[PDB]
Structure formats: structure tokens, C-alpha cells
Amino acid sequence: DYGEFSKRFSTISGINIVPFLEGTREIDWKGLDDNVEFLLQNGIEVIVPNGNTGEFYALTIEEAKQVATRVTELVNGRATVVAGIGYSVDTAIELGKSAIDSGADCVMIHQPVHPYITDAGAVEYYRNIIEALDAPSIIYFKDAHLSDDVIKELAPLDKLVGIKYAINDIQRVTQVMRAVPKSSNVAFICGTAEKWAPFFYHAGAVGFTSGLVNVFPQKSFALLEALEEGNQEKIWDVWEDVVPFEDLRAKHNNGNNVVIIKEAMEQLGLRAGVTREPVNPLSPNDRLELEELLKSWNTQ
Template identity: 25%
Template sequence: MNPIFEGIGVAITTPFNNNEVDFDAFRRHIEYLIENDTQALIINGTTGESPTLTSDEIRQLLEVGIEAAAGRVPVIAGTGTNSTMNSIELSKFAMDAGADGVMLITPYYNKSNQRGLVAHFSAIADAIDIPVILYNVPGRTGMTIEPETVLELSSHPNIVALKDAVGDLNYTIKVLNMIDQDEFVLYSGNDDNLADFIQLGGKGLISVVGNVIPGELQNVYERMAAGDYTAKHTFTSLMPVIDAVQVDVNPIPIKVLTSELGFGNYELRLPLLPVETQTRDEIVKAYENFKEGSRV
């Protein structure tokens, strides 16, 4: 089975204008990402502030994203919630709208045990006919998908990948050693471990900083995947920008840069608040210094 994508998928931000979704800016951002080698678009994820979006906004963003992508890159819909029934409904909508796959976060707040995770993810995957990416981010959900659970779920024909945002490469290694890597792949969910993750056998990254430097990340991926480990030196040059967008809770810092590039105002929805002016200036300066250095 082929992966949905290889390389850099971008968890795209949701632009706002006076607290309304700015669909024109969203379309422009998609064009920028595709023109700069993004390999997939992930819509309505954490970076897209999905918990603060209305049901109508979630559906509209997905429909607009699929239309704007026009089949040039896969579109993956974030459809996971802490309700299996709601997740099934949203996943069916995504499939009918033309999404190429869905991404399912582990249930949060009510959480689950591992048996519950198997039942939850399997029920959603049974209800649709497009690929499923599991999303393991214990720092946000308060629980993890244990490697043995990943192995069990990987046998489902529709469950094809894991977004691994655990941040512990020992977990990554354990999962990679257990699963059939011809049938099930891992994407990193942490920008800062891309080079090491790919060297271990990961097939790409679902990125935050890719909202503004997708091509540079894709270059690192392609070289690393081809065995050119000198790309690690190139990756090191990206770290100031990666670090800059990690100074506060995602997506607060990355939206500083998307707004600088013209993809919506610097607006977030509560409970998220913008960074202070000094921090904003520092984020922009880190990006500008990087871009200036890349032109030398």
C-alpha cells in the first residue's frame, strides 16, 4: 500500500478577519503551499484551531480546501473528536466532500483505555472508505496510543499511518520495529525532529512551520530519504525558525508569520491570545534572518 503522501504535509492555519474565517486568505495560502512543494494539506487540525470553529466553518474550510487544491496534492481532514459518533459523522462528510484521508486524534477529556481506542478508531475506519491517519499527541490529550495498540490498529485495511507527536524517538523506534512498514507508515508531528525521524524510517512530517517554509523542509526530506545525511546540516539552519514558532502554544506563534506573509490578520480565537509585541518582533526577525541567509 502506498502512503497517502511522502514528505512534508502542512497542518494549515485558519485565517481570520474580524473573527470571521477569511476564505480568500485561506485560498491564497493553499496556492503558496502547493507552489512551494507541500505534499499534502491537513485541514481542521490543531494548528487550524479546530476546537474553536463552528460545525459550518469546519465543513466550509474542508470544501474550500478541496476545491482550491484541485487534486494537485492530497487533502486530509482532521475529523477526530472525543465522541465516536461525531467523529464518524464528520469523517463521512469528509469522504463525501472528496477528502483523500482523515486524521483522528485520540479522545480527550473523557479519554479512554487502550481497548476503547481500538474500538473507537475501528468504528470510524469501518464507516468510511478512505485512508485513516491516527494522531498520537499525549501532551494535548492526556493519553497515548501504546505501540501494541498501534500494531493492532495497523491491521485494519483503512488505517494506514500514525502521526507521531509523542516527541520521544524511543517510542518511534518501538513502533517502527513492530509494524509492517510496507503497509503502515509514520509521520512525525514534531518539526524539530524531522531529520532524525526520517533517518529512522519515517515517511514525512505533518508540520506547523511548514506553513511558511514548506519547500525548505521538503528539500531536507528528499535528501534524507535518498540517504544524503548531509541534509542534517541544512536542517540545522532551519532551527531558528522552528524554535521561533515554539515560543508559545501552537498556533499562536506560527500565525505571526502567516499574517506577515499576507495569509490573514494576526488573529486567534479565545482562549488563545496573540503574543506580546516584543515576542512578535523576535519571531518575525528570526524568519527574516533565515530568509536573508538562504539568499546568500
């Protein structure tokens, strides 16, 4: 079951958005349903509700639970659903149990928000949450200050079926990947999307997360196909074609990450609404750059 479960991540892990109505900023449930359908219709096999692309941290615990339940029931098993969870140990467990009870297949443990953390404490935190949940777990690993030994010590756990490695250190990625036995049934996914997928794949990654799929999933799948085949020239061509989008999202220390996707969607006639605080709409200059890039893509 587990070893086979980890296999499901050798593809694109799409992180859906959570449309919010302009004005009140309340969740736009119809828009949410439409985004989920959009993803499934375009080939997405793994959907990640309550990921950062869905502005998880801008939701109350009650809202988070409702989003995971809604996305899970809409998917109705047409894809693997990974529910994001976080916060204190008991709160993460509360969220996980809620998602699993709603039918979610797996949970993704967000980077702890705690300002203070150690390797040893990290292992306890992760172990305690994973063991308390009756479903597989995936860890989003992005704190370069933590040792990869944390992963090596946890990897053996049957419930730990994947790591969305998000530290863009190609040396470390290759190292941890080579140190974890295949018997640990741990899927290593590039947690930094399309811009880094090619490099993580060369090192051994079997999949990658994506926010681009909410707007141009065909470009994202074009990369997955080029990667799975081995067409180096195609890989680089597609890579070079989408990096501009990922670089825009990274502006202002990633402050533009979701707002770039929502405004792009709204320009293409897709229902996305706006982002919640602490992110406002794009600056005029940033909006101009986005329109420019979209104008280009239309050309191609």
C-alpha cells in the same frame, strides 16, 4: 489500492492555517483559498485541512465542515487531501462523512479530547470510526500514556494507511516502527515536524508534518530533499536553520504554535489574520524575538 495509497505520505504533510479576520474573527475565505494555493504552488502534495494548525478546535462543527469542503474543492485533486476529524465517535463519523462526500481522499483522527482513555477503549474508539468511514484513515498518536500496542492492533486494518506519530520518544518510535509488518501498509509520519524529522527518519519514518510550509516551504522542502538523499551535513544545516522557528512555536507549552505562523506570514505580506481564542497575539517580547529571527533569515 490501500497499500499504494499509503505511499502518498512519503513526503511533507502540510497542515494549512485558517485565516480569521481581525475584529469579528470570522473565517477569511479568500485568505484561506490563497493559503491553499500557496501550498500547492510550492510543491505540497498532501494538504491537511482541519489540523491543529488550522485551529480546528476553534471552529464550530458547521465551520469545520465548510473548511474541509472548501479546501477539498479548491485543491480539485491537485494533491491528496486529508480531513481532520475528532470529538465523540458519532461526531467524528459525521465530520468524516461530510469531508469524504466533499471529495476528501482521507481522514485524520485527532487525539481524542476525552480526559479519560485506556488502551482497550482507544482501540474501540479508533476501530469504530475507521470502519464506519468509506475512505482511508490516519491516526494522530501523541498520548505517551497509551501503549504502542494500540497501533499494532489496528495496523492490520486496510483502511488504516498511516500513523502521524507525535510522541518524541526515539526509543518508542524505533520500536513500534520495527514491530509493524510492511504488509500492514502503514505509513509512519513524524507528527512533530522539522525539529524531529531527522531523528524519526533515521529510525524509519517516511515523512513529516509541517506548519512551516505556510511561510517558508522552500526551507522545509530543503530538509525533505536532504533527508531523502542522505546528505547528513545538509540535513543538519537545514535542521539547525529551522529549529529556532519551531522552538518559538513551542513556547508557552505550544501556545505560540499557530500565532507564530500567522504573525510571520503577516510580516512577509502573506494573508493570515489573527488566531481565535484561546490564543491572542504575540507578547511584545515574543514578537521581538520573531522579528529578530526573520531579520536573520532575510540575511541568509
